[PDB]
Amino acid sequence: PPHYTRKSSATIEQVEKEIDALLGGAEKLRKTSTDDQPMDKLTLMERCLRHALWSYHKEEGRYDFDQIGRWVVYTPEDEVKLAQLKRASQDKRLDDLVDLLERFKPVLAREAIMQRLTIKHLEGQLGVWRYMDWCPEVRDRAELEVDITGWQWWSPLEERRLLPVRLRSVNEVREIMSKTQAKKSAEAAERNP
Amino acid sequence: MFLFFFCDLFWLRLLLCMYYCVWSRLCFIVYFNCLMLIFDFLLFCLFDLYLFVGLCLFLLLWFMLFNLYSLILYYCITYLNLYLLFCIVFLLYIAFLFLFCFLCDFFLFNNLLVGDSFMDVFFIRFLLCFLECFSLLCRCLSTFLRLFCNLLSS
Amino acid sequence: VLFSTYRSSRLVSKEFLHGPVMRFRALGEYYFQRAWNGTLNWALPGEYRLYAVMIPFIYFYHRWHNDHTLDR
Amino acid sequence: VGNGPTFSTGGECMNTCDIQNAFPMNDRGVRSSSPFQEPNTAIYDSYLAWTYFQPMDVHIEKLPAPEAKYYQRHTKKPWDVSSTELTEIQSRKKYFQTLGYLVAFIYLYFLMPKEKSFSGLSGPDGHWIMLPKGRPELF
Amino acid sequence: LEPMSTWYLASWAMVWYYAFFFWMPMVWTDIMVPSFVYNKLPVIHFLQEKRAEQKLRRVLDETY
Amino acid sequence: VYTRWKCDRLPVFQLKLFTQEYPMHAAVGIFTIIFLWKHMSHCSEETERKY
Amino acid sequence: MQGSWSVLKKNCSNFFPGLLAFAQQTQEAYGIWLRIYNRQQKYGPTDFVEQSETFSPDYHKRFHSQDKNMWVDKELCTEVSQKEVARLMTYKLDMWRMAHCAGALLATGGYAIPFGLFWLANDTWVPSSFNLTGEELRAWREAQDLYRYRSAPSYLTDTKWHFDFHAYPWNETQERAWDDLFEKNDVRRDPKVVRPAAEMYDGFIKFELIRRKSLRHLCRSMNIPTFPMLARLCNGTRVRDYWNLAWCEDYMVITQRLHESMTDEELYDYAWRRYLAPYDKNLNREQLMERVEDYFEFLGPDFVAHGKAPNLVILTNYVLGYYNDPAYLEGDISELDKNDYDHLASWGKDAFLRRLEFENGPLRDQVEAHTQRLLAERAAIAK
Ligand SMILES: CCCCCCCCCCCCCCCCCC(=O)OC[C@H](COP(=O)([O-])OCC(O)COP(=O)([O-])OC[C@@H](COC(=O)CCCCCCCCCCCCCCCCC)OC(=O)CCCCCCCCCCCCCCCCC)OC(=O)CCCCCCCCCCCCCCCCC
Ligand SMILES: CCCCCCCCCCCCCCCCCC(=O)OC[C@H](COP(=O)([O-])OCC(O)COP(=O)([O-])OC[C@@H](COC(=O)CCCCCCCCCCCCCCCCC)OC(=O)CCCCCCCCCCCCCCCCC)OC(=O)CCCCCCCCCCCCCCCCC
Ligand SMILES: CCCCCCCCCCCCCCCCCC(=O)OC[C@H](COP(=O)([O-])OCC(O)COP(=O)([O-])OC[C@@H](COC(=O)CCCCCCCCCCCCCCCCC)OC(=O)CCCCCCCCCCCCCCCCC)OC(=O)CCCCCCCCCCCCCCCCC
Ligand SMILES: CCCCCCCCCCCCCCCCCC(=O)OC[C@H](COP(=O)([O-])OCC(O)COP(=O)([O-])OC[C@@H](COC(=O)CCCCCCCCCCCCCCCCC)OC(=O)CCCCCCCCCCCCCCCCC)OC(=O)CCCCCCCCCCCCCCCCC
Ligand SMILES: CCCCCCCCCCCCCCCCCC(=O)OC[C@H](COP(=O)([O-])OCC(O)COP(=O)([O-])OC[C@@H](COC(=O)CCCCCCCCCCCCCCCCC)OC(=O)CCCCCCCCCCCCCCCCC)OC(=O)CCCCCCCCCCCCCCCCC
Ligand SMILES: CCCCCCCCCCCCCCCCCC(=O)OC[C@H](COP(=O)([O-])OCC[N+](C)(C)C)OC(=O)CCCCCCCCCCCCCCCCC
Ligand SMILES: CCCCCCCCCCCCCCCCCC(=O)OC[C@H](COP(=O)([O-])OCC[N+](C)(C)C)OC(=O)CCCCCCCCCCCCCCCCC
């Protein structure tokens, strides 16, 4: 295949260590739940990072089935493939994993900021000015909307669009992954004849 | 002749400065309908239909600081004059009317000719148009007259 | 170039008269910044004690003015 | 716990407001008075119902401090004024305005005489201004 | 009745005109717009939280 | 971010408010002020004595 | 940007050389415009040449129609080159600002001089010709970028708020496009994902129905003078002319692949004139090419096939989204360990506050149980 140049330099060991550090600080905050219940942000980040990491490892050759069966199995077809089992693409996957980690870090930062804001709110020591300073996007949107004659504080239509949004359950993730795998397989069929 | 006088709101201005140096939410508005003109969704207006919200809010605050506190004995309604209220209503009403007229859309006035084509144009429809054009100005006059008379009588 | 049009062009330091200003804000905030102090169009507060204090004061100073300046 | 205020409510009940979905609901079924999660929110029934949140000492698992790179945005502009700075500016301005209004109120209602008194003991009777000067040809 | 009078109507109306042209901007910047921004804050916070959750959900859904 | 009410000083915001938000209202108000000071700014001596 | 004495000295020193350069550019730009205008009148469609009237459905007010009153000259490369079109666009901006200043001078006679001192003290409204060196040009471009940053967010918020408050998307793909259109410039928007918003908004507000306030915001964001604004069909005419020239140049570049051969500085200027690449971002050729390619992809195949660009309102929002920086956040997180209401600590709690703490504190369940039991006992005794 054609050669691919990495956008950033980083080793797989360094990436794994960074992932472990990122997930280690939130262990106390992380809470387990039933498989059918909705997942949390920490759970979603851990699943995505570990899935990418172990897919890269299995492609490389580090066939550690104990962890691959946990962080990569989400479909009956995937389970069958695992049972049967038991360069440019790798570089792109590693770069994508690094980008994903850099994308998740700001989310955790915002979560920590919100935790501290909530702590000060419960104490009765939080002014609205401080909250707007430490939640800049809300502040800017509100100020701009009022400045352009958008006085109203209710947005029923946008809420209707976004109200039912929520993180999915593990079973829902399995179903969606199965659908995507089926779509990809059908795509490769068309590619073949 | 130039008379120098002051309004009777100085203590209330002091209280406003003291109590509104920090932000507060407002959830009760005397005239809330200025904020919700459209009730059916997917309807929108290209005209600046929310331009009246700011003037409405300020007018409510001003008139409330005067009229509601006038129930306290010896409190003075400084603006209580017929022609001054006429000036206020003239400003608001004529400003909005001129906003619609400066649009230079004559079709906007088609609805002034009341009735349908069945009705005689000269002897019925035109007279109704005359009465409706008169009624706009009479609505302005009645608005200011009602506001003045209610306070005075009470 | 002579005067700035932006409010961000400060004329004093951030700590100028901090203490007196904080005392003034404490006086303002203690009774007004409360859940039950919901105003009607900024003119009628929800706190009862604001009425209890301000109605007598307004009447008192208006009556003094009327008795000593107008009816005189 | 302290006596400080919390997120303003406007005297509204969040269990029946038009934006109630924006306020989280706790286990007891009382929607919060703020965007934050509140465990002890309550509702009080005067002529109108209103939601109230009582601050209390509660411990929350604090996620460790992130790096400045991942939450600081250095997009400040010359026109930009932060909410904290605006609060400071407005506090000082309103303090001085309050003092000035206090002086004005005292003078108006306790020192200023009314014009055109019957006895002539207090207040001015008025006078003419803008009279011509040094214009003999005018007459 | 002075309410029916006109002999000092201009000076009398100056009170309303000063309130409209000079005090209304101060009330606008200091009281009204702040209150409406405060009213806006919660819904915007909720909608942006939902948008962030939507982004995370889409990120998860594209993995296989 | 930039907003007129938060970033501009009071005189600047006043001009903007009455020039790009309520220009017609300002025009009508100025018209009425001119009318009042042109036709309602005089009082005779007898009127002063009466009222 | 705010006025400064250094910029005042710069513009006073280069005032007359700048005027001479502006006059020379005026002659050159008149020649270019004459060629373009003759070609438009000769080969243009009948509706475009005759200036067909398109009225709004509510108040029947005429405004430019994107389909009928805008025309992409596919064969303009024969008569006018890409560089000439860029020169004409730059001169149009400079000429608009100069024309407003000249109008002020003629209107107010000699009383405009102090306002001229305010004018030369800022690079926001001076022509590009007043800069005779690279550093001066860089500062001038910085001033233009600052004005764009100041004005764009209001335009974007106006559009988004009005639509979201009065309408909603029809289908999921439109929802995703609308949501991703107004993302901050720190994230990359996929033009294929965002394109459907153009049709969705065509259903809501075409360019022919754009409101006067929205137009004022847009012209502010485009560095077009807005005072005196006057009727909306004047600055609307300016916007239409500028983007018609831009689309002609875009067709030329796309067809002839000129951007690949375009040098770094010229490519940066090309992106900047499309409101895609701020100079303060210090973009390299890779980023500039990515943004330009995204712009071409947003235009879509139909642009090359038929010369029809997407809705101009949505296009302007898309390009101006590059000036929608993330909301600033300065200060270490440790600042969140402080308290805001220490100045109230001396006041303590009054009787009502103590009652509220007692009833809603950790003992709230006990108080509620006791109160309800007492009330039940009293009710039973009453009956
Ligand atoms: C000849 C005798 C004298 C008179 C001459 C008059 C000449 C007239 C010329 C011809 C005019 C013809 C047309 C007239 C039409 C009148 C119509 C009318 O009245 O309508 C009613 C209408 C009533 O309005 P309103 O609802 O009451 O509100 C207006 C108020 O001002 C309140 O509104 P607001 O609160 O919204 O206003 C904003 C307010 C916002 O709030 C504040 O800023 C708070 C303060 C408020 C002040 C203003 C209120 C005044 C209260 C009464 C007076 C206070 C006490 C004065 C003591 C005097 C003692 C003798 O800010 C300000 O007021 C800004 C000014 C602040 C000044 C601060 C000064 C600090 C100095 C510190 C010095 C320290 C030195 C230390 C040294 C140390 C050394 C060691 O009046 C107006 O709208 C204004 C009419 C003005 C027309 C223009 C007149 C021309 C200017 C005359 C100036 C004279 C100066 C010289 C005097 C010297 C002493 C004798
Ligand atoms: C001495 C008496 C003075 C009277 C009092 C005046 C008071 C001040 C009011 C303003 C006066 C004008 C100021 C100078 C403007 C510069 C010249 C000009 O038109 O620039 C083009 C430019 C065209 O703008 P546009 O939006 O592109 O036009 C769209 C068209 O489709 C464009 O057409 P296109 O797309 O097909 O492209 C054509 C383009 C193609 O050309 C090019 O591309 C080459 C460049 C050509 C233009 C170059 C302009 C350069 C401007 C800067 C000059 C240097 C300043 C130096 C300053 C420092 C000096 C030390 O060429 C043009 O721009 C031609 C436009 C049409 C000609 C307009 C001139 C008509 C009046 C002159 C004839 C008067 C004869 C009197 C006979 C008397 C009989 C009794 O003009 C402007 O930017 C508009 C002026 C902006 C300020 C407006 C202020 C309000 C105006 C209200 C007026 C109401 C009526 C008057 C009474 C007022 C009472 C309240
Ligand atoms: C040699 C040179 C070359 C030759 C000449 C070439 C041609 C030159 C002319 C053309 C130049 C065009 C470009 C100009 C750009 C600069 C414009 C400008 O001013 O920028 C703001 C400029 C600063 O600009 P910047 O820092 O660069 O920031 C620009 C940003 O981009 C911020 O930008 P922004 O967009 O945010 O700012 C915009 C802002 C611009 O406005 C402002 O920024 C306001 C500026 C004034 C603020 C004043 C604040 C201080 C007040 C002090 C009060 C007195 C204090 C006490 C003094 C005591 C003295 C003893 O707002 C507006 O645009 C509003 C426009 C309003 C239009 C009004 C139209 C009214 C029409 C009437 C109705 C008609 C209806 C139709 C009726 C028809 C009937 C038939 O402001 C200043 O520098 C302030 C100067 C203050 C001077 C001192 C105070 C006044 C002194 C008066 C003395 C009077 C003496 C005589 C008295 C006699 C008594 C009897
Ligand atoms: C807390 C208390 C503080 C104190 C408060 C003070 C008291 C205030 C009380 C009342 C305030 C409200 C009054 C409102 C009145 C009604 C307004 C209205 O109906 O507006 C409709 C409407 C609204 O304006 P717009 O165009 O839609 O947009 C306004 C936005 O602000 C445009 O914003 P934008 O963001 O779209 O554009 C931003 C930027 C965009 O930048 C640009 O566009 C580039 C630069 C443009 C430069 C100007 C080009 C002008 C072209 C020709 C204009 C037409 C000329 C007509 C013939 C001349 C008539 C004299 O534009 C600018 O920066 C504009 C700079 C203008 C600076 C001057 C502002 C006034 C400062 C005071 C100076 C004069 C003092 C005289 C009195 C003292 C004498 C001793 O106005 C117009 O249609 C404009 C027509 C302009 C006609 C010329 C002026 C007529 C008035 C008489 C002038 C007398 C000159 C005297 C000279 C000296 C003699 C000794
Ligand atoms: C210090 C100086 C003071 C100056 C004072 C003078 C006033 C201010 C001067 C100018 C100020 C600058 C800004 C002006 C407004 C700008 C408007 C604008 O942006 O237009 C853009 C627009 C450009 O856009 P466009 O796409 O090219 O064309 C417009 C589209 O068609 C648009 O398409 P559309 O879909 O919108 O189509 C509709 C459009 C269609 O119209 C047009 O757009 C076409 C152009 C206008 C045609 C107007 C003539 C119509 C036929 C008149 C027939 C009269 C017959 C009478 C016979 C009498 C026999 C005895 O509009 C109309 O249908 C409106 C028609 C007019 C209706 C008039 C109703 C008046 C009712 C009177 C009530 C009673 C009054 C009192 C009592 C009187 C009697 C006792 O400009 C124009 O079309 C022309 C603008 C002309 C500006 C005015 C020039 C001023 C010259 C002043 C000379 C005198 C000076 C005196 C000085 C005195 C000493 C100081
Ligand atoms: C939202 C609805 C609000 C309703 C509020 C209801 C308030 C109920 C008040 C009960 C009676 C109060 C008696 C006060 C006595 C004071 C001393 C005295 O002598 O007064 C006698 C005076 C006059 O009594 P008098 O007429 O018998 O006086 C006799 C005096 N001689 C004989 C010389 C003539 O009493 C009053 O005028 C009281 C009337 C109160 C009416 C209600 C006013 C409400 C509007 C103002 C609200 C202000 C809130 C401000 C908050 C801050 C805002 C930022
Ligand atoms: C005890 C007696 C009690 C009587 C009570 C009677 C009721 C009083 C009510 C007062 C309060 C309510 C007032 C509401 C407002 C009324 C407005 C009104 O009628 O005013 C009209 C009046 C008419 O003005 P005028 O009275 O000077 O008219 C001049 C006419 N000649 C010269 C023939 C005498 O308007 C004004 O006073 C303002 C005039 C200046 C502003 C307008 C200037 C532009 C004019 C444009 C047309 C002409 C010029 C050419 C075009 C422009 C060229 C640049």
Residue C48 to residue C40: CA distance in whole angstroms: 14
**Closest residue by Cα to residue B110 from B132, B93, B95:** B132
Residue G236 to residue A41: CA distance in whole angstroms: 47
Owner of token pair 């000429």: G95
Residue B150 to residue G46: CA distance in whole angstroms: 64
- What residues of B are in contact with residue C42 (Cβ under 8 Å)? 16, 20, 26, 61
Cα C56 to ligand 6 centre (Å): 6
Residue A56 to residue D55: CA distance in whole angstroms: 49
CA angle B47, B52, B57 (to 5 degrees): 155
Q: Is G101 in the pocket of ligand 3 (CB under 6 A)?
A: yes
How far C72 CA lies from chain D's nearest CA (Å)?
9
Owner of token pair 């990120």: E59
**Closest residue by Cα to residue G286 from G309, G264, G318:** G264
User: Which ligand is closest to the CA of G216, given by its number?
Assistant: 4
G277: CB partners within 8 A, 6+ apart: G268, G271, G283, G287, G288, G291, G322
- Give DSSP secondary structure letters for G187-220: SPPPHHHHTHHHHHHHTT--GGG--HHHHHHHHH
Minimum CA–CA partner of B102 in chain G: G231
Please check whether residue A137 is in contact with residue E48, taking contact to mean a CB–CB distance below 8 angstroms: yes
Please check whether residue D121 is in contact with residue C47, taking contact to mean a CB–CB distance below 8 angstroms: no
Amino acid at D104: A
Please check whether residue G181 is in contact with residue G318, taking contact to mean a CB–CB distance below 8 angstroms: yes
Of F6, F26, F37, the CB nearest to E10: F37
Amino acid at E5: S
- What residues of C are in contact with residue G341 (Cβ under 8 Å)? 29
Please check whether residue G282 is in contact with residue G107, taking contact to mean a CB–CB distance below 8 angstroms: no
Residue G70 to residue G240: CA distance in whole angstroms: 7
Amino acid at D116: K
The answer for B43, left when phi > 0, alpha when psi is -120 to 50, beta otherwise, is beta
State how far the alpha carbon of G382 is from the alpha carbons of G373, G374, G375, G377, G378, in Å.
14, 12, 10, 9, 6
**Closest residue by Cα to residue D84 from G330, G17, G356, G120:** G330
E6, E12, E17, best to mutate for ligand 7 pocket (most atoms within 8 Å of CB): E6
Residue A70 to residue A50: CA distance in whole angstroms: 9
The answer for C33, left when phi > 0, alpha when psi is -120 to 50, beta otherwise, is beta
Please check whether residue C33 is in contact with residue D8, taking contact to mean a CB–CB distance below 8 angstroms: yes
Residue A36 DSSP code: T
E9: CB partners within 8 A, 6+ apart: B81, B83, B84, F36, F40
Element (H, E) at D41: strand D41-45
- What residues of B are in contact with residue D90 (Cβ under 8 Å)? 21-22
Residue A191 DSSP code: -
Q: Is B102 in the pocket of ligand 5 (CB under 6 A)?
A: no
> Exposed, middle or buried: residue G166 (CB in 10 Å: 0-12, 13-18, 19+)?
middle
E53, two tokens: 């959750």
Q: Cis peptide leading into A156, omega within 30 of 0?
A: no
Residue B133 to residue E37: CA distance in whole angstroms: 40
> Hey, how many other C-beta atoms are within 10 angstroms of the C-beta on B107?
10
**Closest residue by Cα to residue C36 from B30, D9, A124:** D9
Q: Is G142 on the interface with D (CB under 8 A)?
A: no
Length of chain E measured in residues: 64
User: Can you list the alpha helix ranges (DSSP code H) found in A86-169?
Assistant: 88-123, 128-134, 136-147, 156-162
- What residues of B are in contact with residue C59 (Cβ under 8 Å)? 72-74
Solved using: cryo-EM
G84, two tokens: 């000439």
Residue A26 to residue G215: CA distance in whole angstroms: 48
Chain E segment 36-55 residues within 8 A of B by beta carbon are 36-39
Residue G74 DSSP code: T
D120, two tokens: 């002539």
End-to-end Cα distance, chain F: 56
Q: Which residues pair with G329 in a beta bridge?
A: D73
Minimum CA–CA partner of C24 in chain G: G343
Length of chain D measured in residues: 139
Residue G257 to residue A161: CA distance in whole angstroms: 41
Minimum CA–CA partner of C1 in chain G: G3
C32, two tokens: 């007004």
B6, two tokens: 């002051």
Residue E23 to residue B59: CA distance in whole angstroms: 12
Q: Is G29 in the pocket of ligand 2 (CB under 6 A)?
A: yes
State how far the alpha carbon of G220 is from the alpha carbons of A115, A119, G73, G146, in Å.
40, 42, 28, 11
Element (H, E) at G355: helix G351-360
- Resolution in angstroms, to 1 decimal, for this deposition? 2.7
Residue D79 to residue C9: CA distance in whole angstroms: 9
**Closest residue by Cα to residue A56 from A45, A41, A67:** A67
Q: Is E25 on the interface with F (CB under 8 A)?
A: yes
Inter-chain contact G157–A139, Cβ cutoff 8 Å?
no
A70: CB partners within 8 A, 6+ apart: A50
State how far the alpha carbon of A12 is from the alpha carbons of A18, A63, E64, in Å.
10, 15, 20
- Reported in sequence order, the residue ranges of chain A that DSSP labels E, i.e. its strands, are none
A152, two tokens: 């109203």
**Closest residue by Cα to residue A152 from B27, D21, B23, D86:** B27
Q: Which residues pair with B28 in a beta bridge?
A: C40
User: Which ligand is closest to the CA of G231, given by its number?
Assistant: 5
Amino acid at G226: T
Inter-chain contact F29–E17, Cβ cutoff 8 Å?
yes
The 3-state DSSP class for residue D58 equals: coil
**Closest residue by Cα to residue G156 from G320, G278, G272, G274:** G320
How far B98 CA lies from chain F's nearest CA (Å)?
8
Q: Which residues pair with D73 in a beta bridge?
A: G329
Residue nearest to atom 68 of ligand 1 (CA): D100
Residue G64 DSSP code: -
G111: CB partners within 8 A, 6+ apart: none
Residue nearest to atom 17 of ligand 1 (CA): E11
- What residues of D are in contact with residue G344 (Cβ under 8 Å)? 2-4
F37: CB partners within 8 A, 6+ apart: E10
G227, G230, G234, G238, best to mutate for ligand 4 pocket (most atoms within 8 Å of CB): G227
G161, two tokens: 């708020």
The 3-state DSSP class for residue B21 equals: coil
State how far the alpha carbon of A170 is from the alpha carbons of A56, A174, C27, in Å.
22, 6, 54
The 3-state DSSP class for residue G382 equals: helix
Of D21, D57, D60, the CB nearest to A163: D21
Q: Is G185 in the pocket of ligand 2 (CB under 6 A)?
A: no
Please check whether residue D3 is in contact with residue G344, taking contact to mean a CB–CB distance below 8 angstroms: yes
**Closest residue by Cα to residue D83 from F3, C24, G234:** F3
State how far the alpha carbon of D74 is from the alpha carbons of A120, A136, G309, in Å.
25, 12, 35
Please check whether residue G241 is in contact with residue G92, taking contact to mean a CB–CB distance below 8 angstroms: yes
The 3-state DSSP class for residue G290 equals: helix
> Hey, how many other C-beta atoms are within 10 angstroms of the C-beta on G375?
10
Q: Is F30 in the pocket of ligand 7 (CB under 6 A)?
A: no
Radius of gyration of chain C (CA): 19
A6: CB partners within 8 A, 6+ apart: A91, A94, A95
Inter-chain contact F1–G153, Cβ cutoff 8 Å?
yes
State how far the alpha carbon of B136 is from the alpha carbons of B61, B97, B98, B129, in Å.
26, 10, 13, 11
Residue D122 to residue D104: CA distance in whole angstroms: 19
> Hey, how many other C-beta atoms are within 10 angstroms of the C-beta on B13?
20
Inter-chain contact A146–F5, Cβ cutoff 8 Å?
yes
Residue A45 to residue G244: CA distance in whole angstroms: 47
- What residues of C are in contact with residue G116 (Cβ under 8 Å)? none
Residue G294 to residue G284: CA distance in whole angstroms: 16
- Give the 3-state DSSP-derived string for chain C, with helices as H, strands as E and coil as C: CCCCCECCCCCCCCCCCHHHHHHHHHHHHHHHCCCCCCCECCCECCCHHHHHHHHHHHHHHHHHHHHHHHCC
**Closest residue by Cα to residue D7 from G255, G90, A123, A172:** A123
Residue G340 to residue G59: CA distance in whole angstroms: 53
Residue D65 to residue B108: CA distance in whole angstroms: 62
Q: Which residues pair with D45 in a beta bridge?
A: D49
Q: Is B91 in the pocket of ligand 6 (CB under 6 A)?
A: no
